[PDB]
Amino acid sequence: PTYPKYLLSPETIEALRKPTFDVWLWEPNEMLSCLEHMYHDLGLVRDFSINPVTLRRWLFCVHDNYRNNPFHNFRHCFCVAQMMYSMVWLCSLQEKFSQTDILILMTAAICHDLDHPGYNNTYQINARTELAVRYNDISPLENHHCAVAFQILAEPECNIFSNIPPDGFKQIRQGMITLILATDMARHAEIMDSFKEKMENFDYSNEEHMTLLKMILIKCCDISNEVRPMEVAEPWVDCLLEEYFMQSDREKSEGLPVAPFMDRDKVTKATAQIGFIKFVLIPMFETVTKLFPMVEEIMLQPLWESRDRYEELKRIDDAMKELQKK
Numbered sequence: 001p002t003y004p005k006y007l008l009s010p011e012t013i014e015a016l017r018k019p020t021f022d023v024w025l026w027e028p029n030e031m032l033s034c035l036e037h038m039y040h041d042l043g044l045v046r047d048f049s050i051n052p053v054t055l056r057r058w059l060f061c062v063h064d065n066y067r068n069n070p071f072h073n074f075r076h077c078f079c080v081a082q083m084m085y086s087m088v089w090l091c092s093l094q095e096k097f098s099q100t101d102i103l104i105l106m107t108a109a110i111c112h113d114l115d116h117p118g119y120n121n122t123y124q125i126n127a128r129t130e131l132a133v134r135y136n137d138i139s140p141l142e143n144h145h146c147a148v149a150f151q152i153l154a155e156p157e158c159n160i161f162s163n164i165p166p167d168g169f170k171q172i173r174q175g176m177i178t179l180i181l182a183t184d185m186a187r188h189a190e191i192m193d194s195f196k197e198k199m200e201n202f203d204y205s206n207e208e209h210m211t212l213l214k215m216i217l218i219k220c221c222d223i224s225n226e227v228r229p230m231e232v233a234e235p236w237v238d239c240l241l242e243e244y245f246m247q248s249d250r251e252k253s254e255g256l257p258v259a260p261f262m263d264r265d266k267v268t269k270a271t272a273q274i275g276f277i278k279f280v281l282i283p284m285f286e287t288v289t290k291l292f293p294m295v296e297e298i299m300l301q302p303l304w305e306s307r308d309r310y311e312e313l314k315r316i317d318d319a320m321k322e323l324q325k326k
């Protein structure tokens, strides 16, 4: 008949495989069903004997541990996971990666921003927060996201790894930790350099090579909003700036340094994305494209289009402010 929302329709399940998926259409419950379907569809439930009910309880617990920040929230984690899911199909990753690696990629993507406070590492460090003190200024947020991820998995009713032998667990844990920590943008240049260094003669059978490729994959997915259709990507920019301005505001009231790229007075939607697309997104997907050429047309294309559109927006934004400032 006319089924309920949480029962995904065959059209949605089909659409869920492409980077064009409208992530804004669904409520959390529907997004949880989407994540659940990903695990079954990728054959992870099957190959890792994941209790299908535990899979649901786990996702629900994961959701409960994401905060309602304007950007680093559950919907962001759904975006990262859904783009990873898309890349698996787009790049035929199951031909290159083992099911354990797929499991690592997906679980890390879902768990990568757990219990994010809404203020980055620079804020944690400068304000000497409890997190910065706990982690000695070393990627405190990522270390925390990772720790929460395993405290959750430590709860029996949420342990989707309960049927994986201990050696498998250790391997997965290590892999997840590496990937989540790799999402700290402060290490972006470092990670990109190491990847390109191995990209000179890439070897899919080289464990070090694959680890770096997985780090790049989760990084690509994490900052992949702009790869999505303009109408889906744009509203994310306002969410990010909302979070950024909240921090710079607070940093001014407490006397802590402020990052220009978070300055309510020097940043616009356009200036924020132009540079990020040109010097972070495009270069990275460009190197990834060497390994998977199909990535150019499906993701580099929209990035080029976004870059051009934001440059146009900037021109009129600049023109508009040339009528202001008495």
Ligand SMILES: CC(C)Cn1c(=O)n(C)c(=O)c2nc[nH]c21
Residues within 6 Å of the ligand: 185, 222, 223, 224, 225, 226, 240, 272, 273, 276
């Ligand atoms: C998280 C943030 C520091 C990096 N970051 C991001 O993840 N996305 C998606 C952007 O669009 C963006 N624009 C500037 N920085 C960005």
Ligand SMILES: [Mg+2]
Residues within 6 Å of the ligand: 112, 113, 141, 183, 184
């Ligand atoms: Mg993060």
Ligand SMILES: [Zn+2]
Residues within 6 Å of the ligand: 076, 080, 112, 113, 183, 222
């Ligand atoms: Zn993230």
